[PDB]
Subunit: 66 residues, 2 copies
């Protein structure tokens, strides 16, 4: 098994989604349901996560804060 | 008003991709937004509106120019 690593580009805590920045690669969509932690995502937090293919494209899963 | 841009890429198996806007952020587009008989292809110039969907801004009313 492996994981992706990056940092929260932005996360809107009213809307419930944002994107993760991956150095050299595409941003990855992240929904609030993908957050494994106690607290919500905030700009700049480094995260480990995996990418799953949703109906409308890739998105983050199992997002943990490093 | 309508935005204008050009197809950056469109995954023709899954039905999604992005429209690039000059000096602007990319806009996500889904095959259901296409106002025409044919799919989107790289480099096609398009007009479109932006509406709010499940992933934020997405293209709507996409017409090939």
């Amino acid at each position: 098994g492996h994981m992706q690593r990056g940092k929260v580009k932005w996360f809107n805590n009213e809307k419930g989604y944002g994107f993760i920045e991956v150095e050299g690669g595409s941003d990855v969509f992240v929904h609030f349901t993908a957050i494994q932690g106690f607290k919500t995502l905030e700009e700049g937090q480094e995260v480990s996560f995996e990418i799953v293919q949703g109906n409308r494209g890739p998105q983050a899963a199992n997002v943990v804060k490093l």
